[PDB]
Design a protein around this motif. Structure first.
Motif: not given
Lengths: 204, 206, 204, 206, 204, 206, 206, 204
Positions: E4, E42, E44, E50-52, E147, E150-151
Motif C-alpha cells: 500500500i 483508492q 490500483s 494499491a495507492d490510498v 488503509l 480500502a486497498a
C-alpha cells in the motif's frame, strides 16, 4: 428430573385435581384450529408435575378433562389462552372458563419490554430457565423430548400467576385484567366464528 | 321533524329521561381524549328529540347527565362507544354502563361490508340520510352554529332505531351472546385507552 | 378582481412594504430544491393585493426581496414554510427569518381534522373560497390564470395568522408554536443539507 | 473503576455538582410517560462518579435535582433527551434546559451509519463497552439489584466524554449551529410529546 | 503483506500508471454525495498494489488522479461504479469515463445467485478471501486497518474484469454489458441531478 | 382532420416516408412480448397522416417497415419506446435505432408531476385530447373497428409535435445530453427485457 | 455411501431404471427458464445411486432421459417440480408426467411450519443432512467440481424416501386426493409459467 | 323484462334443465364460507331466463339443485367459480363438477387488460350492459331489485363461455384452460380445508 404422567385420551380420574386452578397448554398440527387438530393436552395441578395427554384423530370425548374445563370453580391458567381456548372448545364442545392468561397479565404489567413470551417471563419473574424447541405432534409415538417440552409449558403457570397478580395490584390494573379474562373466552369464540384476523374493538 | 333542546353544562333535570335506554354521543376538539377536551354531549330519549349540551372548558361536573351514566337500569346506546365512554369518563369521572354499541353490533352482523360508519348504517338500515359536513369543525366555538347543533343531534336521534334493527340481526344470525360480552368489556377497553393502551389490541399475540 | 402587480426579477422598491409582516409563497419546477429551480415569488403586504415576481433561470440576486427576507423585524408568513424557506435560501443565499407557518399553527390548533391545506383552512377560518389548480412555472410567459393562482396563495395569510394566533392562545399552545417557528428555518436548512427525508428528533 | 452513590428520592445536596454540565438519564416502567412512572434518575458530574436516585411511586418533589434542571448555567447532557426531558418535566414540573443530546449529535455527524444507540457510540467513539441486559427490567422494584444500579450508572458515566467527541465532530463537519438549534427546540419537542403529539412529526407536510 | 502506498491529496505522479485500465473505489462520510464528502480514493494499476489517497475537506483539486479519470484511453474499473462515479464527479468536476463495472457484469452473468457483492464474487471467481469491515473515514489519521480495508477494494478488480468478460462472451451478453457501461456515467449524472431514487427507464 | 391509411402486413412502399423522423407505436395482445403477439404497427410521417398496419398471427417479415427501422438516418419517435422496441425487434428481428422517447423526455423535463402518459402530455403540451377507451381491446380481431383504427392512429399523429416541445424543454432546463444518452441506451434496455431482465433495474444496487 | 455415475448429454441406457418411480432434479444458470439454460439433469432410481448428466449449451435431445419422462407407468418425483418440469419441457420438448412433488406434499402435511425446503424436510423426516453451498454456483462450468456433483446427486438420492413418508402423512391427515389433484395440475402450472404466467396465480381473484 | 322464476329452498323439478350446461352464481352473508351462510342460488339453463332460489338458515338439502351439481354430464358455468364452489360444497355436502370458469378463461385470453369482472367482459364480449349493485341477502323478503341483480349474474354465462372457448382456441390455450377447470374444484376444497390465503403452487 421432570415428573410427567403420560395418558391416552383423558386423565384417568381427578385424584390429583382437587384444586381451584389448573395450568393448561396444548399441542396441535398448526395454528389454524379448523384445519389443524388437537394432538396433546398438557395440564398441571400446580405441584410441579404435569399430565401429558395424547389426543387421537377424531376423538371428541375426554370426560375427566372436560369436567375441569367446565368447572366454574376452577380457574384455567394459560400463557396466551386465546389460542388454546379456541382449540379446546373446537375439540370438546365447550368453552373453558373462568380463565387467567399470563400473557395478557404480562402485557398489563411488564410495560418496560416488548417480550412477553413464556421463556422470557419465566426467566425474569421466576429465575426459571426453560428450553424452547416445530415438530409433528400427531405422531403415533411422542418422543421423551416432546413430552418434556409439553410438560414445561404448564409447570410454572401457577407461580407466574402469583407474581403477576401482585404486579397487577402494585401497578393498579387488577380490575382491567379481570375484565380481560372475563372477555377472553368470547375473544376465542369470535376467532372460531370467523373473526380471527379482526380486532372487534377497532374503529376500522 | 327533529326537536333540539340546547343546554349549557348539563341537562336541567331528567323529566324527559324516564326511559330504559338513552342514546349518547360527544363532540371534542379531536381524537385524543387527554389532549382534546369534551365540547358537546348530545343525548336522546329515543322519542325523536335530542338534547345538545355545550360543555365548558375546564368543566368538571354534570350531575344530571352523570346520574344517567351511573344508572345501571338504563342502557347507554352509542355508535362506537369506545370513544365516547373514554371521553365521558375522563371528563366527569364516571364510566357509563351498561352499554350497547351500534358499531360493534354492525361488525357482528353486516358481514358483507367493511363500511360500518353511522352515516352508512343509517342509510342502509333505516333509509335515513345524515351529513358529516360538521364532523370536523370547531366544537369549542363560543356559540355553536345551527348546523353544528343539527349534526350533533342527528348523531343520537336514530341510535334507538338502529339498536332495534341490529338486536334483531344479532338474534337472527346467532351472535347475541358474543355481542353482549363485547358490550360488557367495552368500558374496560375504553379504560385501557385512557390508561395508555389506545394503540394496542390487548388480545393480540404480539 | 384581484389586484396583482407583476414584476421581473425583484420588487422595484419597498414602498408597499412598510410593514412588520409579509405573506410569501413560491412556484418552482418541482419538489426537489436542488434540481427544480425557483420560478416565481409571490408576496403580499397584507392589504389584499399581491406582487408576483418572475424569477429567471440562473438569477441569484433579488435585492429588494432579499432585504425583506433578511429583515429580522419583519415576520415572513407561509403556509408550510418548510419548503419555501429551503427554496428561497437555495436561490438567494440567505435563510429568511423570523417566520410564522399557518400549517404548523393549524396542526397545533385544528386537532379535530387531518386536513390542513390552504384551501381547507381558508374555507373554515375565513369563509374564503380559493380555487386549486400542475403546470410549467418556468414558462417564458405566465398565463393570467397562473398569476391569479400564485397571488391567491398569499392574499389571505395575514388573516389566517390572526385567527390562528387567537386559537393558539385559546388552546394553550402559543409558546410551543413560537418554538416551532424559531426552529423552522433550521428544519429547512437540514433539508437542504441532506436530511429532507428524516425526522431528526425521531428515536430511529 | 466506576463509583456509584445510591440515594432515595433526591440528591442530599449539590456538593458534587459545582460543574458547568451534568449527565442525566432516567429509568421508568416503560416508554409512555403518562402511564409509566419515573423510577430512577441517574446523574453524573462528569468525573467518573454517578448518583443513582430511586424515585418513589407518587413522588412529586426532588428539590436538589430540580435546582440542577432549572439552572440555566448548567448544560444537561442526555442520550436521546427527548424521552428524559418529558419524563422529568412530567414527574417534577420543570422542563430542564439548556440541553445537549448525544443522539441528535450522532445523527448529525455519524452520517455513515443508522446505528445511533448509546451502546453503539460508546463503543465506536470511546472504545467503552456497556451492556443492555437490564434495560428492560422491573425498575419499580422495592430494592434495585446491583446489576440495575450499574446499568443505570453506566448510562451517565460517559456522556460528558461523548459530548466532547461529538462537539468536535459537529465543528469539523460544519453543523454546530444546526445542532444547537435542535437542542434549543428539544424541550418543546418533549412538551409536544406530553401534550399529545408523541406520534407526530410536527414539521411533516402530512 | 499488502503493498500500500499512502498519499495526501493526489498521486505524486503517474509512473505506476502507464496502463490502459485502473481499479478504483472511494470512501466517504456516507451514502449521500451532496452531504457526505469524499474522504479516500483508492486506486490500483492492476499489479497487486494499491495507492490510498486521503482527501481533505474542501479539496477540489487532484491533478494526477484527474488526468487518469479524464483519460479516455484508460478504462476505470469499479465494483458498483454508479456510486463512486457520482462521488468523483461531484468532488473533482469531471465524470470519469470510460468504465467497467464488475457488479453490473456480475448481474448479467451470475444469474444463478442474488449475491453480487465484492466479497462474494472474489470468493467464487478468484478463490480470494477479503474481509468486510462502518467507520469515520474523515478522521485526521486513518488506521492501518482502514488503509488495508480500502486497498482490498481495488486489488482484485482487474482479475474480476478478466473473468467476467469471458463469462459475458460465453453467455452472449458482451454487447449489452458494453452499452450498460457506456450509459453508467449518465446514470451517475442523473443521480447527482436529482433522480437518485428513480429508474428513468421505468413505465411509472 | 386526421387521415388514416389502413394496410395489411406492411407499408406498400416508402413514398410517404422521405422524412428525417417517423412516429411509431404498436398494439399487442398484452404487455408480455414473448406471450402477447404484435397485432398492429402504427406509423406517421409527422404530416398529420397515419398508417395503421394489421399484423398477422405468425407474421415474420415486414420489409418496408423494417427498412425504416434499420435506417440510421431516420429517428424513430416513440412514447415509451422501451415497450415498442422490444415488440418490434421480437416480431421482425431488427432493433430500431436511433430513437427519441417522449416519455423519457417528459420525465426529464416535467419535474412537477408524476403523470407522464401520452394522453396527459398531449393535453398539457399540445392541448390535444385523446381517448384511451380502446387501449385494452382485442387487437387481434379479424377486422379492426373504426374506433380501434382511430385510437391506433392518434397514438402516432402527435409524437413529432411532442418531440419538438420536449426537445426545447430539454435544452431550456439543461438536460439534452443526458436525454440523448438515455435514448442511446434504450435499445439495450429493450434487449435486456427480451433477454430476461424485464422486471429488473440493471443499474440498481440490489 | 452414495454412488454417483457421471454422464455427458444423456443416460447411456435404461438398465438401471426398471423401476416404477424415478427421482429427478435439474441445475441451471438461474431461475428464468427462457434465459437460464439447463446445465445438469440428476436422476436416481431410488436405490441409493444417482446419475448426474451434464447438458451441453444448445443441446436439444436426450432420448433415454426423455423415454423416462414420457413413460406414463413411471412416476417422476421432484422437490418443487414446478421448476424442473418447466426446465425439462423447455429443454427437450416433453412435459413429464405423472409426477409427485415433495414440496407440495410437505405444504399439505407439515402444517406447523413455513419451512418446506428440501434441506429442511430431509433433516426433519429422514434425519439426513444436505448442504446448499453449491446451490448457487456456475452450473455451466466446462468441468463440474466433485462438490457440484455431490450437491446435484444429494438432491435426488432421498426423494423416494421422502415420498414414502409424505404419502403416509397425506393418508394420515386425510389429504391424499387433494394432493393427487395438485400433482395432476402441476404440469399445466409449469406450462403456464413457460407461456407467460410465471408471476401470476391463475386461481386468484385479482 | 327479465324472466325470473322465484323459488324457496330448491328447484321444483328439472323440467327446464334438460341441458348439458348450467350457469350458476350465489349470494351469501359475506366472503367467509364458514361464517357467512348461503342465502341465494341463482341458476340459468341458458335460455335467457333465471331461477332464483332463496336458501333458509340451517337448510342443508336441495335435492333437485344437488342433482344438477352432482351430474357429471352437466358443466357448471361460473364467473369466478372458486368462491361459489366452496359455498355450494359447504352448504350441500358435494363439490360440483365438472366446471367452466369465465374468469379463469378471461385471464387466459384477455391478456390486454387487467379487468376481468363480469360487467367488463359482458360489455366487451357481448355488448351487454349489466348493472352492478352490498346488501343483506339473508333478509326474509328479497326485493325485486335483489332478484334482478341475482338473475343478471347467470343470464349471460353460456354466451360468455361460447366466446371464451373460441378465444382460447385462437390463442392456443384450450388444453391449459381445461386443466385449470379440472383442478378448480380441488382449489375450492383446499380453501374450505384451510388454505384459502395460500397459493399451494408457490415456492414460498
Amino acid at each position: 428430573s421432570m415428573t410427567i404422567r403420560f395418558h391416552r385420551n383423558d386423565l384417568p380420574n381427578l385424584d390429583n385435581y382437587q384444586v381451584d386452578a389448573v395450568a393448561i397448554d396444548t399441542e396441535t398440527l398448526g395454528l389454524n384450529p379448523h384445519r389443524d387438530r388437537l394432538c396433546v393436552v398438557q395440564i398441571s395441578p400446580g405441584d410441579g408435575t404435569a399430565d401429558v395427554i395424547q389426543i387421537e384423530a377424531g376423538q371428541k370425548k375426554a370426560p375427566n378433562l372436560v369436567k375441569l374445563l367446565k368447572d366454574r370453580s376452577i380457574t384455567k391458567i394459560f400463557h396466551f389462552g386465546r389460542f388454546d381456548l379456541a382449540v379446546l372448545a373446537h375439540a370438546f364442545g365447550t368453552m373453558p372458563q373462568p380463565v387467567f392468561c399470563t400473557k395478557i397479565a404480562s402485557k398489563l404489567t411488564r410495560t418496560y419490554t416488548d417480550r412477553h413470551g413464556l421463556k422470557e417471563i419465566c426467566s425474569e419473574l421466576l429465575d426459571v430457565s426453560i428450553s424452547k424447541q416445530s415438530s409433528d405432534w400427531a405422531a403415533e409415538v411422542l418422543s421423551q423430548a416432546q413430552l418434556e417440552y409439553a410438560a414445561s409449558d404448564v409447570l410454572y403457570l401457577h407461580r407466574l400467576k402469583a407474581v403477576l397478580e401482585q404486579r397487577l395490584e402494585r401497578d393498579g390494573r387488577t380490575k382491567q385484567a379481570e375484565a380481560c379474562f372475563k372477555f377472553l373466552p368470547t375473544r376465542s369464540e369470535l376467532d372460531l366464528m370467523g373473526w380471527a384476523e379482526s380486532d372487534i374493538f377497532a374503529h376500522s
